[PDB]
Amino acid sequence: EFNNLIPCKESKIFNKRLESTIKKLENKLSKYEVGSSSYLAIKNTINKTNNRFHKYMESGVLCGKDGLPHLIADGRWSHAGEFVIPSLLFIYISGWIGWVGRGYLSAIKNTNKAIENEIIIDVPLALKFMSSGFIWPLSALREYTKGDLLMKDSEVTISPR
Amino acid sequence: KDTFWTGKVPPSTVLGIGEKVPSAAYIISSVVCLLVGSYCVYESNLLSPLTVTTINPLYVLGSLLVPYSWGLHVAGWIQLKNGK
Amino acid sequence: MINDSQIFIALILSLVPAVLALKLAREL
Amino acid sequence: MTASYLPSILVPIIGLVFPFISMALFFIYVEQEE
Amino acid sequence: TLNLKMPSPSFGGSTGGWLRSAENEEKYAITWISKNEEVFEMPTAGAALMRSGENLLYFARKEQCLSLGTQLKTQFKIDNYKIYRVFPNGEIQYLHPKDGVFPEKVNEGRKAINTLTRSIGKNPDPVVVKFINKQTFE
Amino acid sequence: RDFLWAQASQVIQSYGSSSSAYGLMFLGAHFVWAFSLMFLFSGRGYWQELIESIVWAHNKLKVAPSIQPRALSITQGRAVGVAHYLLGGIATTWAFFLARIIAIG
Amino acid sequence: VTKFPKFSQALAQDPTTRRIWYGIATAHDFESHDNITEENLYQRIFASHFGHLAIIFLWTSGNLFHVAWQGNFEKWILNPTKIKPIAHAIWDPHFGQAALKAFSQTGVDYPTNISYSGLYHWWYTIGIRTNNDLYLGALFLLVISGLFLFAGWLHLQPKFKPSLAWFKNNESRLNHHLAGLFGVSSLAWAGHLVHVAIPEARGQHVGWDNFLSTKPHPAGLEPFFKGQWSVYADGPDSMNHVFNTSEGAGKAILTFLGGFHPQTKSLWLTDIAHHHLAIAVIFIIAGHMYRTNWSIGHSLKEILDAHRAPGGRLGDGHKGLFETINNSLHFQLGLALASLGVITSLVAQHMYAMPSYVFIANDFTTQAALYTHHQYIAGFLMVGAFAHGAIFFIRDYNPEQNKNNVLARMLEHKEAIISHLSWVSLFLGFHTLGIYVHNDVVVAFGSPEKQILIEPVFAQWIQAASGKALYGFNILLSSSDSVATRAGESLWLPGWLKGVNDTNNSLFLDIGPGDFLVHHAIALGLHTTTLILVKGALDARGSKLMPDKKDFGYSFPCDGPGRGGTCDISAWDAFYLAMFWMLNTLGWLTFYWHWKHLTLWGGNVNQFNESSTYLMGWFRDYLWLNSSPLINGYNPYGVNNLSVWAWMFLFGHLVWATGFMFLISWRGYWQELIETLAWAHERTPLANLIKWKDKPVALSIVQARLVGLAHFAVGYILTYAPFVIASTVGKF
Amino acid sequence: MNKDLLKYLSTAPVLGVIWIAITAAIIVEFNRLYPDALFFPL
Amino acid sequence: AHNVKIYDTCIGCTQCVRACPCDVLEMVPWDGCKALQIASAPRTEDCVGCKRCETACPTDFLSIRVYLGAETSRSMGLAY
Ligand code: CLA
Ligand code: CLA
Ligand code: CLA
Ligand code: CLA
Ligand code: CLA
Ligand SMILES: CC1=C(/C=C/C(C)=C/C=C/C(C)=C/C=C/C=C(C)/C=C/C=C(C)/C=C/C2=C(C)CCCC2(C)C)C(C)(C)CCC1
Ligand SMILES: CC1=C(/C=C/C(C)=C/C=C/C(C)=C/C=C/C=C(C)/C=C/C=C(C)/C=C/C2=C(C)CCCC2(C)C)C(C)(C)CCC1
Ligand SMILES: COC1=C(OC)C(=O)C(C/C=C(\C)CC/C=C(\C)CC/C=C(\C)CCC=C(C)C)=C(C)C1=O
Incomplete structure (x- = not known):
């Protein structure tokens, strides 16, 4: 399947993009003297460009008829690096930020500086919570089953209905 | 008639004209309707493709027994649990 | 194609909804 | 009288007469004290 | 009673004063007594000179009179001012302070108008007064 | 046609060149301008009510702040609105002007 | 007291110009009028409905009449893909000679407007062939208009006013509307197609003069009464049939071919006839559900009261809803608007993909006009549905009588609903805008290969399930071996699969990463508009x-500046805010439809595929590129037929921008200014002879919001309409 | 280190800016040393 | 005229009366609260609907409420 796509290493359009990009850069390069700072800058761009195109060619990312990488995000594991693995990374980090932030908020509410510690952070206290985020999934799961994650509906304010 | 009900079982009067019909009548008829209806669908469409010259009115009529059997088995359960 | 006679018949007939519209408008 | 004359007769009436009669009538209506 | 012949503060005039509606609908008068000559701000803009003794001003709106009243009270400690509504036909209603005492001070004799014997959350739903003249807050 | 459409050709064709920053700023500035209209056309009564529902979700999960969220004041809504309107509007012209005059001048 | 408005003493006693404005603005809110009874309300609504129907029929009459009289229908049918259809003649004494010439290029010797409504295509399909056909149509609809007008008047007369009980007879109305209004109307239309449209398509004249003697099929109704119905399918139009001729013509009156007539690029007329016959049967059967005068059938109240899930997750279920709905015209109107809003969108989507009118797929400007028209109408209907839902909650909802039913339980978790809609809107917004901006920055710095381009594989899979072979998914109708494929192979599948797999039509367009991003944009728009309306x-x-x-x-x-300030707190204000979002969403989707088609029709799909993944692509390749014909409608060198669209385009910009005055500057500024004007008038000699009867005041706070929104919305439509039309005319 | 100064360094905007700047630096430095990661390599 | 109503949660603080720029309101004797007084609205024909009274009211929810109604020259605040 994906008959409308092709591997970028097999793509003639993808290869022509490399050629045309480099050809432009080499024209720009000819305007400067060998050894000059300008010349070296353009050379670095040429190397970086070559590295990028070759990296994508060796990856097995698919290319459209435009000759550009198209990502598959349906769950199949042959394209896990395109979305699933980035997703797991994002969830782990974002959940950490949320979990440690929630923990700090609750800690300061049990003090006389509940408001002060929101605008002037208790940095030792904050770093303790930030340091404890690495197992937030298990923490959060246990807190849920203990009945400590959520307030009851009758204990939260609501408007008339 | 107020048809509102509480708890786990509706009270037979929801069945309308079929409120006095016994549980066994509904339950057996539901199995028969499902099997005959399934057979009509199979014969019409699945055993060889349907063509313009091979539309049997009985199989078309018979296919309506499939949704009808659903209703019959719900009515059967209602009567079963009401004691009827 | 369409004659003067046909256009006048239309205009005359359009007086019927005109008058009736007036009546409905007033009654509302 | 022909039909091709009709736009030149009607458009001035629908555009410069009918609206100003309507505006005048509505103005009289909304200012009536009764 | 008002007294139409009472003297006015000294003022060079402005374009902010009253217009036709004051002549043929209604205007308001404020009188007061001052101990000394004093400059104050007209609610229609500009400085005017308060006479020592009696002072009479006319305005288009009740709110202009009361605004001046508040200025008299706050800035000059004058609390003896009176406000009247004056009709074109010559009739005069006394407005404020209605019964001699300022409204912010409790006074026996006053009767509760527009009070309700419930909290605001116990008003009926709009649907209940549908097709009758009642309001939900009545 | 002869001013806006014709002279915008430089800024609008700047991607992939050294003038690409102006192309980006031109679009970015159109965005900030349009975003200003959210503040100018709305009022805080709507926003304070929306915040109430969001606060409900935070209270449910025991993560509501002690510094209570409020919608911006009426005046701040106006200030934010005009500040984004001006920034967006002026930066659009800036990008338009520079991209054009650097190409032809 | 000034009498107007007679329906509101509160307004009539107002001494200012506000009396007139508010009089106009509340004239149709009958429930709010002085001394309204429930019976009078229903009677007045019924008469107003007759008035509205008459207006629809007069409008249709006018379209027919103007085309009959001033159009070129008879010439157009001889060469439909080349000749431009005429809407009506122009008579405008402001025109100079150069403009007269520019608008007189449509074959005929007088200035005209070209039609983009698709009426010619429709009328030709359904069997109209002459100006006399059109003229008699126009005459007929004049008479129908008058009839409805008369019925309106009649049903306000004492002895013909219907009772409140008649108006709340739900079961009878549903039976008649399903079986009669829908079912029989559909059956009669199948009659028209079989007796008239299909013969006329095969070159045979059938009219009132000969239709009693002309059989739609040689076999007559003999096969019908003998149950030999397959006779009516034998001998379809060949693939070489030339429309409006006998060359390649068939005899079949009912078929299931699927796909398109090759010449006309439109659905087969024999399929359309059979469609209408089949749904007519279903509708007529459906309209025997409810109990009227003969004991059989269902009570709506009994069905509703019984529908409670026994596990208790829906509380008391639908108990109480019958009374709630039966006593609320706003609930009913909200249901009607929502349902009609969905259907109007479905019309837009299905008519571009599966056109029914001959040669309309070739008329690009008409196709674009019709899609945009119906999607905008649908947008308005959806907002109105929710507006009336809010009005229902204020005016008609009784908490006591709805206790613990599905409607009451919506209010019980309103914070959960609103907060989740907020989340989903933010989630879509941050990421869709984010990806677009990633793509813009990386393309701007000369690396389009760094773009994030997600294939819309789920949508491609759904296309494959209907038999699109391009993707190689080998699923269902796109696999030879599937039971789905086998089942339909002798009926509609050959015709359908041909149309699907043809790249030169709009039936399942190819979709790529560009289509992915704009669909998430559309989703953002639907969710946010809904957020505002639901809140x-x-x-x-x-x-x-x-x-x-x-x-x-x-x-x-508002409720004043206390408690932090309460501007825009009313439910009406939610409607006002939602309108901006509805217009935005409709902008995005119509821009999408139009650009996708401009590049399809122009044979450069690659332009769309490459440019659409970053926002500068839309700005440059869509807006800037396609503006050129429009803005040159007039210039220093002269005028062409796009002159009028060029002028309208600028008119739209002006009206839109004037709206900003009302939306940004609020009332108090203006009231102070008007005071100084009242001062000047009274103190100016000569002028101050003249006196106003109504004291001039600045517009109200709500009035400003409404007037601002009106200008914004009118300007939106009058800008986009010329662009969408002139862009396409200019290109093709 | 002076307690009043440390209290000032603990205010929301100061910590806000420092923390965002460090985060931004980390992302910049990852992209400076491992450029053009459209996907996780595997 | 605008409708002004005072509800029985009034604590007789007098702040609404003090806030009112049109002298619509006054304090009258009452038994229902510790202050032994309640707000009253005897002159609503002079009410402009500015809602300064509601801004001043400390109770939750309000004890004074202004329902905007039929406009007059007085209520629209016209000096012409
Ligand atoms: C620890 C902080 C924290 C946590 C756990 C949550 C959690 C949530 N938010 Mg809230 N939110 C926060 C801060 C937080 N928020 C802040 C500061 C704002 C003001 C911008 C908001 C504004 C907001 C809105 C408008 C909405 C939510 C919603 C939600 C819910 C869905 C996820 C989401 O949409 O986030 C989206 C939130 C953002 C994009 C805001 C940025 C979050 C910042 C970066 C976190 C700040 C971290 C803090 C400074 C760390 C200090 C810790 C240290 C001292 C130890 C979820 C319950 C949604 C909801 O109600 O769903 C039901 C919703 O609509 N939030
Ligand atoms: C989980 C889904 C579900 C469940 C458990 C129920 C359960 C119930 N329904 Mg409900 N119903 C549902 C979904 C459901 N419904 C849906 C989706 C609809 C359509 C919107 C309905 C429409 C409906 C109606 C109109 C009625 C009920 C009624 C009932 C109650 C009695 C059922 C009965 O009498 O069966 C026995 C039913 C039969 C033996 C008839 C078979 C079903 C039909 C006829 C098949 C269709 C055939 C064809 C299309 C029509 C004939 C064509 C031609 C021959 C003329 C029961 C509590 C009844 C009720 O509430 O009493 C007050 C009732 O009158 N239901
Ligand atoms: C069948 C459709 C239908 C029906 C019967 C109703 C009926 C009603 N609506 Mg509803 N409504 C609808 C659709 C409908 N609406 C739709 C589609 C929307 C979304 C736009 C709404 C949104 C809506 C709101 C927000 C409100 C209503 C209200 C009402 C009530 C009357 C208000 C009135 O007096 O109008 C008079 C209307 C006007 C005077 C406006 C003039 C027309 C507009 C501004 C367009 C101007 C176009 C301009 C002239 C063109 C310029 C051309 C250019 C070239 C120069 C009445 C019960 C109101 C109500 O009171 O309920 C409590 C109310 O507040 N409706
Ligand atoms: C371009 C114009 C524009 C934009 C971008 C927005 C954006 C938004 N509107 Mg608004 N709106 C607009 C015009 C706009 N609106 C107009 C003209 C009106 C009519 C008055 C409204 C009326 C309106 C209502 C009534 C509602 C919205 C809501 C929303 C939110 C919808 C969900 C979303 O997309 O979250 C994603 C967020 C964004 C796309 C915002 C921009 C994010 C930026 C780019 C992040 C930049 C960070 C970066 C580090 C730079 C920092 C800058 C530096 C100086 C610090 C979103 C914040 C709704 C809402 O709040 O739902 C929760 C809502 O109910 N809008
Ligand atoms: C295009 C947008 C637009 C337009 C046309 C207006 C127009 C106006 N503004 Mg407004 N304004 C706008 C945007 C706009 N504003 C926005 C976005 C804001 C928010 C910041 C404001 C905020 C604002 C303020 C604060 C003030 C103005 C003022 C004015 C007036 C200036 C005096 C004047 O020029 O009279 C002449 C009118 C025009 C030039 C308008 C066009 C005239 C047309 C072309 C000619 C007439 C055509 C013909 C007679 C039509 C007949 C057709 C009919 C018979 C069918 C003028 C009415 C000021 C004012 O009132 O001055 C006294 C004022 O103080 N505006
Ligand atoms: C006598 C005569 C004549 C004459 C003619 C003419 C002069 C014509 C005209 C015509 C016309 C001049 C027409 C018109 C029309 C119109 C219409 C048709 C309208 C309608 C309307 C409506 C429909 C409306 C409605 C409504 C509204 C809008 C509002 C309120 C409500 C209602 C619903 C009521 C001649 C010479 C031929 C000769 C013979 C005889
Ligand atoms: C607020 C309110 C209101 C309103 C509301 C609204 C406005 C709503 C809307 C809504 C809507 C607007 C909805 C919609 C929906 C839809 C749906 C639900 C659909 C479905 C679908 C389906 C089921 C499908 C199927 C299928 C088939 C058939 C074939 C092909 C495939 C598929 C799968 C696609 C009211 C008045 C009630 C009142 C109360 C309140
Ligand atoms: C009438 O016009 C409007 C209002 O009322 C007058 C509004 O109120 C709002 C809503 C906007 C609000 C409440 C302001 C948004 C402010 C932000 C993003 C929150 C600030 C949060 C932080 C500093 C913490 C985040 C921390 C870090 C990232 C480090 C809008 C849109 C509006 O149109």
């Missing part, structure tokens, strides 16, 4: 900031 409805009765809001009504300015 409007569910908070209409009250909030923490204003717990007693139901006591103030649907529309009111």
